[PDB]
Design a binder for this molecule. Structure first.
Ligand SMILES: [Cl-]
Ligand SMILES: [Cl-]
Ligand SMILES: [Cl-]
Ligand SMILES: [Cl-]
Ligand SMILES: [Cl-]
Ligand SMILES: [Cl-]
Ligand code: NA
Length: 129
């Protein structure tokens, strides 16, 4: 499922991401934007053998199980495929866990490089929320 911008904002908010751990909706949507282009089915293989999954490109090295990342953990306790669903609940819950890990949204390299310190609220501007 490729979400529209305001559609994803709405879904993220309904799942309590809005201002979760102090990050406004604009951050999460911006992050989704540059991480996956709003596509629940986005995957990317990393050089170390791990894989990024879903709308927030959650990584199998720590957070999910894809059965093909030797030495990895499954801290969100889900198969990585659940992160690819048209339903963002799993991605959202797992993201709440990541963003509490100690380093906030810096855990997403695209957020740090492309969203952090920008006018993130542009990302939810005009959305009926
Ligand atoms: Cl699609
Ligand atoms: Cl939309
Ligand atoms: Cl915002
Ligand atoms: Cl991650
Ligand atoms: Cl594995
Ligand atoms: Cl923080
Ligand atoms: Na894993």
């Amino acid at each position: 499922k490729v979400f529209g911008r305001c559609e994803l904002a709405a879904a993220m908010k309904r799942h309590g991401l809005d201002n979760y751990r102090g990050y406004s909706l604009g951050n999460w949507v911006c992050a989704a934007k540059f991480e996956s282009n709003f596509n629940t089915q986005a995957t990317n293989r990393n050089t170390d053998g791990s894989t990024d999954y879903g709308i927030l490109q959650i990584n199998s090295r720590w957070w999910c199980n894809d059965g093909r990342t030797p030495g990895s953990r499954n801290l969100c306790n889900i198969p990585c495929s659940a992160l690819l669903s048209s339903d963002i609940t799993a991605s959202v819950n797992c993201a709440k866990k990541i963003v509490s890990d100690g380093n906030g949204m810096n855990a997403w390299v695209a957020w740090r490089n492309r969203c952090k310190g920008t006018d993130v609220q542009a990302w939810i501007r005009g959305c009926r929320l």
